[PDB]
Write a protein that binds this ligand. Structure first.
Ligand SMILES: O=S(=O)([O-])c1ccc2c(S(=O)(=O)[O-])cc(S(=O)(=O)[O-])cc2c1
Length: 131
């Protein structure tokens, strides 16, 4: 686990499946839930689940998905929610403020149902590239 992400309240750990599906696990423990960001400019950053090559994106469906094409979709409107994490915003649908989080239960969302208000987006990165 040279790198992994964690949700504030959610207490889950985003995961990227090599099948082409995303989600969150109350506790990191899957084939590969590795994560990684690639900020390219304030209010616009990238994310690549370093492992298989899955870029954390959000299709028009508003459901976290992979995109082999890093452009106006894979990006993630990132700014600052608190003073540590990095609450992004589906740049593919920022007009709906479809943040990047996962129901504090164990199951991401899809479409209109991913807007901050508590602390289920506050993603705390805990990388440690040491292997
Ligand atoms: O930031 S977010 O748009 O990913 C998001 C989404 C859902 C949330 C819910 S939910 O309606 O699924 O029971 C509860 C809470 S709470 O009051 O326990 O901190 C925070 C949430 C944050």
């Amino acid at each position: 686990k040279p790198k992994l992400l964690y949700c504030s309240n959610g207490g889950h750990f985003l995961r990227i499946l090599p099948d082409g599906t995303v989600d969150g696990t109350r506790d990191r423990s899957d084939q590969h839930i590795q994560l990684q960001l690639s900020a390219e400019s304030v209010g616009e950053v990238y994310i690549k689940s370093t492992e298989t090559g899955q870029y954390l994106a959000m299709d028009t469906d508003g459901l976290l998905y992979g995109s082999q094409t890093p452009n106006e979709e894979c990006l993630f409107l990132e700014r600052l929610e608190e003073n540590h994490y990095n609450t992004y915003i589906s740049k593919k649908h920022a007009e709906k403020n479809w943040f990047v989080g996962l129901k504090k239960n164990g199951s991401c969302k899809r479409g209109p149902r991913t807007h901050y208000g508590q602390k289920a987006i506050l993603f705390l990165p805990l990388p440690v590239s040491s292997d």
